[PDB]
Amino acid sequence: TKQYERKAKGGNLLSAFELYQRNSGEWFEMCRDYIQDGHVDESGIFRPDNAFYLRRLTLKDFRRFSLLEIKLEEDLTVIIGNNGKGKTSILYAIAKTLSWFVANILKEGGSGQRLSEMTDIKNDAEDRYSDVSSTFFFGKGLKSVPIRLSRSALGTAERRDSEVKPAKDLADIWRVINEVNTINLPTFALYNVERSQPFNRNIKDNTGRREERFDAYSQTLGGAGRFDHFVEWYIYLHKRTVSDISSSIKELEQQVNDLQRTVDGGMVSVKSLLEQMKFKLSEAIERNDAVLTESVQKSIVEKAICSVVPSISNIWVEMITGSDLVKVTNDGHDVTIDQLSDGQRVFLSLVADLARRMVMLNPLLENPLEGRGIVLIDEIELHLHPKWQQEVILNLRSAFPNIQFIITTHSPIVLSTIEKRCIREFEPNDDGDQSFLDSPDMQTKGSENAQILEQVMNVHSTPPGIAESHWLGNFELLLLDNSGELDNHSQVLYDQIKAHFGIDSIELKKADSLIRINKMKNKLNKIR
Amino acid sequence: REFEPNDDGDQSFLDSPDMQTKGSENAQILEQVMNVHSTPPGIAESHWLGNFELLLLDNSGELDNHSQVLYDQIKAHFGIDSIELKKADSLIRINKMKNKLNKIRAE
Amino acid sequence: RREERFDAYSQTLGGAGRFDHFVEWYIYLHKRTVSSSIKELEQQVNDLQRTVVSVKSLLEQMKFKLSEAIERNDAAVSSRVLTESVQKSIVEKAICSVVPSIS
Amino acid sequence: SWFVANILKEGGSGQRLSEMTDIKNDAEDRYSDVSSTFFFGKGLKSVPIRLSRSALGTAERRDSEVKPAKDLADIWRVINEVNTINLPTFALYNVERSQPFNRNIKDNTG
Amino acid sequence: VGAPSSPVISNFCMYEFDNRIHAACKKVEITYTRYADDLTFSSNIPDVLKAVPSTLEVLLKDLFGSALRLNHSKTVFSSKAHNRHVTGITINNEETLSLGRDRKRFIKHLINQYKYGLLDNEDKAYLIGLLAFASHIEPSFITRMNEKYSLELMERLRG
Amino acid sequence: MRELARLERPEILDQYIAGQNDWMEIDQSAVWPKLTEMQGGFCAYCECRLNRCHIEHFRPRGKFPALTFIWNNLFGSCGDSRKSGGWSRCGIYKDNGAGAYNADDLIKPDEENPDDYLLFLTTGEVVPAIGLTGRALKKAQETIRVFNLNGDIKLFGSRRTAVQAIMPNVEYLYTLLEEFDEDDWNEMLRDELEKIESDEYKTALKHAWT
RNA sequence: UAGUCGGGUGAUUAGCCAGACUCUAACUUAUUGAACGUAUU
Ligand SMILES: Nc1ncnc2c1ncn2[C@@H]1O[C@H](COP(=O)(O)OP(=O)(O)O)[C@@H](O)[C@H]1O
Ligand SMILES: [Mg+2]
Numbered sequence A: 001t002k003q004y005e006r007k008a009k010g011g012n013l014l015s016a017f018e019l020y021q022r023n024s025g026e027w028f029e030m031c032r033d034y035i036q037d038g039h040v041d042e043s044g045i046f047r048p049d050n051a052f053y054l055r056r057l058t059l060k061d062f063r064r065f066s067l068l069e070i071k072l073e074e075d076l077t078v079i080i081g082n083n084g085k086g087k088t089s090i091l092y093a094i095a096k097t098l099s100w101f102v103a104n105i106l107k108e109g110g111s112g113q114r115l116s117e118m119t120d121i122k123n124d125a126e127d128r129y130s131d132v133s134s135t136f137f138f139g140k141g142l143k144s145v146p147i148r149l150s151r152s153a154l155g156t157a158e159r160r161d162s163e164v165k166p167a168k169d170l171a172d173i174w175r176v177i178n179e180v181n182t183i184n185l186p187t188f189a190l191y192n193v194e195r196s197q198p199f200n201r202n203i204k205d206n207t208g209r210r211e212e213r214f215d216a217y218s219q220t221l222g223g224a225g226r227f228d229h230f231v232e233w234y235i236y237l238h239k240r241t242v243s244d245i246s247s248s249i250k251e252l253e254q255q256v257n258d259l260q261r262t263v264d265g266g267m268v269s270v271k272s273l274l275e276q277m278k279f280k281l282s283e284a285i286e287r288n289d290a291v292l293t294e295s296v297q298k299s300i301v302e303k304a305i306c307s308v309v310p311s312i313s314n315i316w317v318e319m320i321t322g323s324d325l326v327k328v329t330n331d332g333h334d335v336t337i338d339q340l341s342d343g344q345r346v347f348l349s350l351v352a353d354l355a356r357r358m359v360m361l362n363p364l365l366e367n368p369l370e371g372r373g374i375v376l377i378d379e380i381e382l383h384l385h386p387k388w389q390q391e392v393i394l395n396l397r398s399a400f401p402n403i404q405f406i407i408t409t410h411s412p413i414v415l416s417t418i419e420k421r422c423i424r425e426f427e428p429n430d431d432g433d434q435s436f437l438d439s440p441d442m443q444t445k446g447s448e449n450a451q452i453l454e455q456v457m458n459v460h461s462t463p464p465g466i467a468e469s470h471w472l473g474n475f476e477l478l479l480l481d482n483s484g485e486l487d488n489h490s491q492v493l494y495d496q497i498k499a500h501f502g503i504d505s506i507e508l509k510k511a512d513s514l515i516r517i518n519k520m521k522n523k524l525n526k527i528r
Numbered sequence B: 001r002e003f004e005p006n007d008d009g010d011q012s013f014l015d016s017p018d019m020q021t022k023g024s025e026n027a028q029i030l031e032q033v034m035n036v037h038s039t040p041p042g043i044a045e046s047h048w049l050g051n052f053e054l055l056l057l058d059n060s061g062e063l064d065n066h067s068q069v070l071y072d073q074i075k076a077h078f079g080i081d082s083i084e085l086k087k088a089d090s091l092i093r094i095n096k097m098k099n100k101l102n103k104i105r106a107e
Numbered sequence C: 001r002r003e004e005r006f007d008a009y010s011q012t013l014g015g016a017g018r019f020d021h022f023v024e025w026y027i028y029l030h031k032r033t034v035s036s037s038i039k040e041l042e043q044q045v046n047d048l049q050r051t052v053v054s055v056k057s058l059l060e061q062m063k064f065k066l067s068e069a070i071e072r073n074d075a076a077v078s079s080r081v082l083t084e085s086v087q088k089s090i091v092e093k094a095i096c097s098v099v100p101s102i103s
Numbered sequence D: 001s002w003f004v005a006n007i008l009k010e011g012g013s014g015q016r017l018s019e020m021t022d023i024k025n026d027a028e029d030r031y032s033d034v035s036s037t038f039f040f041g042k043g044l045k046s047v048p049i050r051l052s053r054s055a056l057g058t059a060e061r062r063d064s065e066v067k068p069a070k071d072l073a074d075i076w077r078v079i080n081e082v083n084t085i086n087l088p089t090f091a092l093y094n095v096e097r098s099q100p101f102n103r104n105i106k107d108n109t110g
Numbered sequence E: 001v002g003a004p005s006s007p008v009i010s011n012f013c014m015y016e017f018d019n020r021i022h023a024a025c026k027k028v029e030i031t032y033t034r035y036a037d038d039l040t041f042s043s044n045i046p047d048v049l050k051a052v053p054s055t056l057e058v059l060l061k062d063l064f065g066s067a068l069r070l071n072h073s074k075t076v077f078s079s080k081a082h083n084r085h086v087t088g089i090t091i092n093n094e095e096t097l098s099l100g101r102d103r104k105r106f107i108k109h110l111i112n113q114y115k116y117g118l119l120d121n122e123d124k125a126y127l128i129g130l131l132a133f134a135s136h137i138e139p140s141f142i143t144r145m146n147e148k149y150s151l152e153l154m155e156r157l158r159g
Numbered sequence F: 001m002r003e004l005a006r007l008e009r010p011e012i013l014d015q016y017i018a019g020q021n022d023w024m025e026i027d028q029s030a031v032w033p034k035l036t037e038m039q040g041g042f043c044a045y046c047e048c049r050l051n052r053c054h055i056e057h058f059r060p061r062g063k064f065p066a067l068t069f070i071w072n073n074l075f076g077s078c079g080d081s082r083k084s085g086g087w088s089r090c091g092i093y094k095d096n097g098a099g100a101y102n103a104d105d106l107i108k109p110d111e112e113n114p115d116d117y118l119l120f121l122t123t124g125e126v127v128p129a130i131g132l133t134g135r136a137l138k139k140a141q142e143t144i145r146v147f148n149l150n151g152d153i154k155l156f157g158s159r160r161t162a163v164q165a166i167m168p169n170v171e172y173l174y175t176l177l178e179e180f181d182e183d184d185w186n187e188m189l190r191d192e193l194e195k196i197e198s199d200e201y202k203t204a205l206k207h208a209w210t
Numbered sequence G: 001u002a003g004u005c006g007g008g009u010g011a012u013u014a015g016c017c018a019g020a021c022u023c024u025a026a027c028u029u030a031u032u033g034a035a036c037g038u039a040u041u
């Protein structure tokens, strides 16, 4: 129609797509370029011309919330608060919304997930229904993609409908354009606390193929990832790389060259091995010679894991014992995945799963980890030592520079690495009627952890329930009661401080300082 | 009972920390017991107050062009009533007093 | 577990002749047989360890071979066994000889 | 686990060390030992227990020494059988405690 | 919506609502208008518009119970920091009504096409209709187009 | 808290009379210049820097309708209910967070010197001054409770950190006394006390210096 | 900085130039009906 033509020529994606569907060249190319066009910035990072991210979320009578609005950052949003403030509820609400995009990229008219009629409606809500409303942004040609998930309480006669058609409309564009000519696709993932699980190599999923591209969407919003699928996929990649003959020739050529250098260096004991390898190389060359995309995929993931996970310097597959084993170099020692600590394993699992999905969904990017998507992480500090908490957000953002991360944390150490604008904070005595969340007043990035505790997390830097925590205060008061001189009572307490905290303690130094200052003040007073 | 940070698995006995933890400040426990800096080392702004102090010491305690720039950066990033700025202000004031003493002694 | 001579008597009089057990076993043997004295092997492992990045795969293979040689050396007279390569070959020939239309 | 097993049943067996996971990878002696000493008042100042496991290749079997655990647990069991006594609680709460709640409550088997 | 009586009836049904909310807004210096189902509030005082949505919900419940409800997804705050429009009319930062830059640029495009005889009859008719609307909303824009394109061209077009 | 000196009535308060008029009607921006002259950009009760701020009825408008447009009664307090909810000290906490209170059992910083009643320990806690009994003790104790001067962690933390920043300087000045004469030394103490006039928590800093 | 407003230029829905704005904070919509603008009468 002429109206659609005008809008499409003005840069509107939905109009361009409508014209493509009715006339089924020009319009197809508009749609495809909208999704694929982008440029490399000054830092060498690919940036899509049309970004995809969640702009805004509204919750009405959902769990603890009567009516709540949240504005999200395009890059990183961190939600903080005490236990039971609804931080996990917020990520759950978002994940269910994203399930509608995933379902419709997989299948025309696919069904996403639903709000629970048993648990998700606020218990004391007078209207007996809940709404989760979201708006997504996809470039200036599609500034608003509104979705609403709704549910009425069990029993209620009036039933409240969801509104999901805009999600389906956008997901249809991705699906249809991809079928004609391959495009990069968005990644959606939820990692909740369910990600901490015991590992089992023996349990294998015989349900779908792992090398099929759309397997990247399998259980993506279930909360655990599928680390088992990663391991299967990684072994698959290894077998294909080993079986490719030229890489084997190149690898064999490299091994022969390394062995020849050792023999030239005076180690005559390895000459027998060199001759065997030279024979193997000659045989391989003689066998019919023909870079595997599989080899590149493997390399990308290995680098991602090693860059993001601090204790891991290498990861590889061994088959020589007669069973396929993934091994890692962890803190300089070669170990199996089963030997890793729970903290290391759980974090490895997160990054491995995410990297796998991004590689599978972004085949046309030089660096597939620069693809688009939304990733939700609950309790990012889960099982991490404070040392790792100081690195985790920086590492993630550097490895996945165009993902929108929405995370929850209880860690001041994590907050010390994040700008105040990214932080959303519950009011301290909320009770679930607060209307909009806001950022803290203090700048957190680069700040001391003790300040973040007190100014942002509302916790004393010294435990108030411990008597010894008050001794210095009491000591000072005693000193001031006796005109600055150590009396019997002040001396006793001084000795208690010394005995408890030690001769080199900051507390004793403070006490000493108080004595010195007060003695000098008193001397001045006497002179006057 | 604490493991040494550099333990390559051959430590005979597990031992108590040297510092008393009960009733101690969190920042001290992090640094003395858990070997973690109070500010995140991988953030540039974490080093600015340290650098500012070094610049003050290098220029005989006077606020030079370079020290002023960094002071302004600290002020701009952390804010007017930040701990970091107050510490910087404190450093300026103490160094001015130390220098005044030094001049009186020289005369 | 590792395979041991008197496993040949396990479930021999009921539970024998099951396809899945064969396939698993056969793949296992293949992986082990893909690609020398213990002292010589010990010396080769030591030399390869000193060199160790491209030779790391070869070192792991040689360490496995050494461990197997030691195990065979340590293993008892009552459990004396043919090499996995030979075992594989005999079974393959048996299958091809016996089963109709498999060559 | 050896105390618990023997409080429940005479000659009950507790849990063993794993041959695959519990032995140090570069152990020269190719076995692992867990040695524990318990205290029960001035009358029984030392209750020593050792759990042992040898690697697969088995040059020599290293046996666990659990008799003191069994002996003490027997006292609790036998005296309790005659006259009810208070019994010790043993519990491990690892990170597996974090898991979803199943709403479906199983009706009273008893 | 398609029935000729429905406009009148709908406006009547909102009469009491409009009375109450208009009066309430006037006390706190808020301007209020309604265009069918579209409610607009504006003010020069910061941090007074935040209370309006809650006030609306109460009033709707009072007058209509659960029959008429706010679409909470469509509640939007704006200011001179951001784009502001009311019923498809842009309010510019000089406090004047505007068609918006994009629409103006599109109209200029069509006039340029007409100048070189590239507009088909359908597009020509479209252009004429849109210029009448432009004349109603932003007469100054027409003056500027006359200056840019020659009064002769524009008069010829509007014949 | 600091002892305040109330200068002169602004002209706008003359017009509005209680009963006829209500506090929504008056222009706040006419009133603030005289408060900012008095208080110097800092809160009446906690002495923090004013950013989010409101004009505060010392005796509230509900309980005391007569005292509404009365210049004695008004003060510039930290926090602002318009801009954000959840503020836990000073004016807002007096009304909402603290329960019942006698208005007579509070230090009013214009009428009285708070240095008589309050003491600021370098550990960051405000405590009643040494040697108070009965009514004077009750007033010191209640002023602390009702304005939440210790119980607000944000304030407690900030005031503590402000004082511990200067305590190297306090210890360094006083060591230099056997060195120096009374004429030169008393200048330097006066120079330090001049600085703190334009700082947050200036009473807490004063008690560290003097 | 970013986003926004938009006077100009530009075979013109682009790009470029100039100037400006900043309550935590626009996402441009719908007919044949109704109303408004223009045309016809
Ligand atoms: N349907 C409901 N009605 C009312 N309160 C609810 C409902 N569901 C959950 N809650 C409350 O909401 C909180 C759930 O916290 P959660 O979303 O897990 O937050 P967090 O992750 O911050 O701990 C608890 O305070 C719980 O009692
Ligand atoms: Mg019409």
Ligand SMILES: [Zn+2]
Pocket: F043, F044, F045, F046, F047, F048, F077, F078, F079, F089, F090, F091
């Ligand atoms: Zn205050």
